[PDB]
Design a protein around this ligand. Structure first.
Ligand SMILES: Cc1ccnc2c1NC(=O)c1cccnc1N2C1CC1
Lengths: 539, 404
């Protein structure tokens, strides 16, 4: 077919040379094959049989696919590629159902060998030259080169696209009420017209493209709704989730339990209640992939439980610009959050959860805020707007924390919602020393080399204690001094320390960490009715 | 015609990813962009141009119309040097300085044909249902350093008539901006600016005198508790990193023992003095602090809370070229980010006003958080460089100490 298309000016990376690789010799069966095809393409205007005036070459292979078992060629550009200049990023940001505006009707157009339809920068082809061997290194084979965007070449995806774009500018402006999407070879075209009007419009587009050389596939290959898009069945009224099969065997290898759990984790984003704690558990200390691990009862149970959930239909609605955008968030567990964005109650546009964001040390409100922003960024991309928030937290809780935290933070417009568990402040150090409460003067000391230390305090009330800690860091002790303190005090304590680390706990009053220690202290802190932390320089 | 400009030796063009935008913002850039396209200021580009810069919209000043902002920060950094206008020191001493937006000058002059690729910017499409709209500049870009450079001769050439019609008024130029400083009382001043506008047209209210640094003031009390002192001493201890003359020896003894935190302590005349001796040292900025032009300028910030934010501008640890505070702006009452970007712009303008360059910021906010929303409140035509930090629990307690 080819085209009357303005080619794109392509160049080789900064000061390099085109690929110079020797043609892997082949069988007579693969040759007679390759020669066959290269005759067709040759005449389809795609490739040009050039002469020995070309030092550049690429390896032409020959495989048999299923759809025919007829010989199919293959050129290895791994080299032309790495020597090919760089292009701007080929749309790696792909559409998401939840962001599609529902349409009266939507066509999907296979743009066929769109690739081989676009001309190549003539001032470039040479680098595409490859050679059809002779019967096992005989005389000279047959030399060729491409005239069009080659399959497997680095810039083809990018160049093809741009072309299509320039070509769509017109038809598109000629009827601003028809939305079109380009990707791979899929030209999905929709609009809010009448099937006829619609049908008649596609035909206008197809002919238009055709006016350039872009031939669009049969009535045969023609795709029929719904459409599969990364595990999604899409009808232009709503979308269903392309069901996922959970294989059942009596022999599970590591490799499997992973592939398995893998898919499961992805299924958590849509299905409510999918857990894998026990399944992940089966990977502990495995010695190899093919290793067959027996499923525990737990593993068999949750695994069996999940089977049902997936055996449930989770449909979907499309994006209606005329309706609000709402996002609701739940705290499935500490650090674990789930969200669902919808315009109409129960008609969810999108859902998802974020694997527990464990960290060095944060608090819920913090974490919530992060979930909030992760969502927001998502939203912008999907709908070009941020949603209204329904958050499991009281405005008072929010004001108190935020209006006082050492870090710039914020949550776009929201509304409280009482979908317990609610997120709250497990505790709040006193703004001032407690009058009455006992006062502990703690101190922790250890040899960092011997890792041996002591820890303790001495209250104003005469109380006192100390402990021998074998194998420890100086920190652990200090904090341990602090720990004991909270253990041995009443429900109101005044504690002073020179540990600059506690000073951190003051400024951020975190409610979760990594070290059981801190953790323990938190559990303690949470328990008291009033705690006043005080730091003072050491020595 | 055009002037040959290149990139710093071995530097390659910027390839920054365009951050996601709002719909309303996109519609705007599109409008805007098609416009300049027609005016020939910019032309769409193929895919063979791999460079790219971030773009975004502003709602600067009273206007339902948006301004277009491009982030040439990386481009600027990579662009060759040109040796700009020296510093009019005195500018900072005027009773009132004003600023103007003259990025509109640039569009006039043509940009060298061979540098344009490097100016490639891209407008996104929601949910990516369309490849971005690739463009690249033909004329001088607003926000690119070379711009005010190239347009220097033609710039000065149009200011003199004013610089001489009024020699009691100082005029400083930075990027797209311009700063006017006169001691005339408001009206005469403001009115006078317009005279310049009319001027410049034929082709910020700052008062820097009541400005700069302020001191630290220690607390005082009829009676002092163990804690009051503890804090007191803790702070003085740190302070000795700026002022070695400071001492807490006596005070520390007063601490010997282990009484209730709330117990009142009688101060020894020694401590009594030593405290006076420290109130004295702190009464003034540390000596021998001079700005080094060959060094990077730094600006740090701490979130005091209650809409409060202290900052410091220095080049060397503990040697503040300036320190200050900033209170939130009416109508930001529940938006940390607004105030922060709000503060930043202000500290940057002071930096430009005082030293004529932009500081490097250390921000008490999360990268994600900042990046997600700064643009929503940005108003300057320029953009400082920034890094995000975890506030030392003391640098704050220390500055939360300044006098008001
Ligand atoms: C896979 C895909 C990617 C991007 N957009 C669409 C589609 N496919 C659809 O079936 C679809 C469904 C609903 C709305 N728009 C849709 N279309 C647009 C063309 C009307």
């Amino acid at each position: 077919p080819i085209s009357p298309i303005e080619t794109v000016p392509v160049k080789l990376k900064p000061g390099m040379d085109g690929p110079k690789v020797k043609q892997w010799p082949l069988t007579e069966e693969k040759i007679k094959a390759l020669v066959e095809i290269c005759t067709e393409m040759e005449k389809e205007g795609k490739i040009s049989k050039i002469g020995p005036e070309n030092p550049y070459n690429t390896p032409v292979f020959a495989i048999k696919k299923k759809d025919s078992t007829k010989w199919r060629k293959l050129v290895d550009f791994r080299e032309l590629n790495k020597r090919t200049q760089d292009f701007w990023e080929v749309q790696l940001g792909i559409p998401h159902p939840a962001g599609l505006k529902k349409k009266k009707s939507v066509t999907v157009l296979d743009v066929g060998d769109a690739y081989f339809s676009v001309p190549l920068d003539e001032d470039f082809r040479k680098y595409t030259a490859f050679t059809i061997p002779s019967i096992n290194n005989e005389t000279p084979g047959i030399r060729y080169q491409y005239n069009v965007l080659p399959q497997g070449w680095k810039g083809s995806p990018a160049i093809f696209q741009s072309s299509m774009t320039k070509i769509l500018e017109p038809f598109r402006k000629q009827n601003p009420d028809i939305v079109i999407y380009q990707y791979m070879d899929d030209l999905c075209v929709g609009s809010d017209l009448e099937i006829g009007q619609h049908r008649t419009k596609i035909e206008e587009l197809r002919q238009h493209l055709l006016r350039w050389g872009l031939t669009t596939p049969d009535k045969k290959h023609q795709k029929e709704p719904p459409f599969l898009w990364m595990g999604y069945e899409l009808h232009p009224d709503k979308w269903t989730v392309q069901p996922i099969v959970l294989p059942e065997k009596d022999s599970w290898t590591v490799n499997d339990i992973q592939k398995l759990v893998g898919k499961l984790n992805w299924a958590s984003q849509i299905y409510p209640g999918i857990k894998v704690r026990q399944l992940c558990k089966l990977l502990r200390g495995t010695k190899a992939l093919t290793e067959v691990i027996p499923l525990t009862e737990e593993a068999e149970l949750e695994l069996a439980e999940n089977r049902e959930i997936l055996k449930e239909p989770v449909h979907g609605v499309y994006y209606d610009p005329s309706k609000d955008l709402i996002a609701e968030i739940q705290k499935q567990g500490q650090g674990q959050w789930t969200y669902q964005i919808y315009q109409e109650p129960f008609k969810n546009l999108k859902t998802g959860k974020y694997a527990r964001m464990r960290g060095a040390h944060t608090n819920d409100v913090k974490q919530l805020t992060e979930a909030v922003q992760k969502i927001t960024t998502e939203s912008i991309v999907i709908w070009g707007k941020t949603p209204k928030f329904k958050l499991p937290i009281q405005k008072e809780t929010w004001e108190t924390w935020w209006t006082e935290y050492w870090q710039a933070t914020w949550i776009p417009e929201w509304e409280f919602v009482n979908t317990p568990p609610l997120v709250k402040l497990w505790y709040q150090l006193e703004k001032e020393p407690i009058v009455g409460a006992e006062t502990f003067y703690v101190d922790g000391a250890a040899n960092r080399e011997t890792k041996l230390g002591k820890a303790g305090y001495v209250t104003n009330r005469g109380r006192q204690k100390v402990v021998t800690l074998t194998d420890t860091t100086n920190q652990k002790t200090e904090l341990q001094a602090i720990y004991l303190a909270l253990q041995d005090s009443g429900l109101e304590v005044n504690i002073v320390t020179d540990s600059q680390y506690a000073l951190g706990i003051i400024q951020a009053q975190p409610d979760q960490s990594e070290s059981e220690l801190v953790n323990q202290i938190i559990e303690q802190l949470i328990k008291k009715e009033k705690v006043y932390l005080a730091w003072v320089p050491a020595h | 015609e055009t002037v040959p400009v290149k990139l710093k030796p071995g530097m390659d063009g910027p390839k920054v990813k365009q951050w996601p935008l709002t719909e309303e913002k996109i519609k705007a850039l599109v409008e805007i962009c098609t416009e300049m396209e027609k005016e020939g200021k910019i032309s769409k580009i193929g895919p063979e141009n791999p460079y790219n810069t971030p773009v975004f919209a502003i709602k600067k000043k009273d206007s339902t119309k948006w301004r277009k902002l491009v982030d040439f920060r990386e481009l600027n950094k990579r662009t060759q040097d040109f040796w700009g206008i020296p510093h009019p020191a005195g500018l900072k001493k005027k009773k009132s300085v004003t600023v103007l937006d003259v990025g509109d000058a640039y569009f006039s002059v043509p940009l060298d044909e061979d540098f344009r690729k490097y100016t490639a910017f891209t407008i996104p499409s929601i949910n990516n249902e369309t490849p971005g709209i690739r463009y690249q500049y033909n004329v001088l870009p607003q926000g690119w350093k070379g711009s005010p450079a190239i347009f220097q001769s033609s710039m000065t050439k149009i200011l003199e008539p004013f610089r001489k019609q009024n020699p009691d008024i100082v005029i400083y130029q930075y990027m797209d901006d311009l700063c006017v400083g006169s001691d005339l009382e408001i009206g005469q001043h403001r009115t006078k600016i317009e005279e310049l506008r009319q001027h410049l047209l034929r082709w910020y209210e700052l008062h820097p005198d009541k400005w700069t640094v302020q001191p630290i003031v220690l607390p005082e009390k009829d009676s002092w508790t163990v804690n009051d002192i503890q804090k007191l001493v803790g702070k003085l201890n740190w302070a000795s990193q700026i002022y070695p003359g400071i001492k807490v020896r006596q005070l520390c003894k007063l601490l010997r023992g282990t009484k209730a935190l709330t117990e009142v302590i009688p101060l020894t005349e020694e401590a009594e003095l030593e405290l006076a001796e420290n109130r004295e040292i702190l009464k003034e900025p540390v000596h021998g602090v001079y700005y080094d032009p060959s060094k990077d300028l730094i600006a740090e910030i701490q979130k005091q809370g209650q809409g409060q934010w202290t900052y410091q501008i220095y080049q060397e640890p503990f040697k503040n070229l300036k320190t200050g505070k900033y209170a939130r702006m009416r109508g930001a009452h529940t938006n940390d980010v607004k105030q922060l970007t709000e503060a930043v712009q202000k500290i940057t303008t002071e930096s430009i006003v005082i030293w004529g360059k932009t500081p490097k910021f250390k921000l008490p906010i999360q990268k994600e958080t900042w990046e997600t929303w700064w643009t929503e409140y940005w108003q300057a035509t320029w953009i400082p460089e920034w890094e995000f930090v975890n506030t030392p629990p003391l640098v704050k307690l220390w500055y939360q100490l300044e006098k008001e």
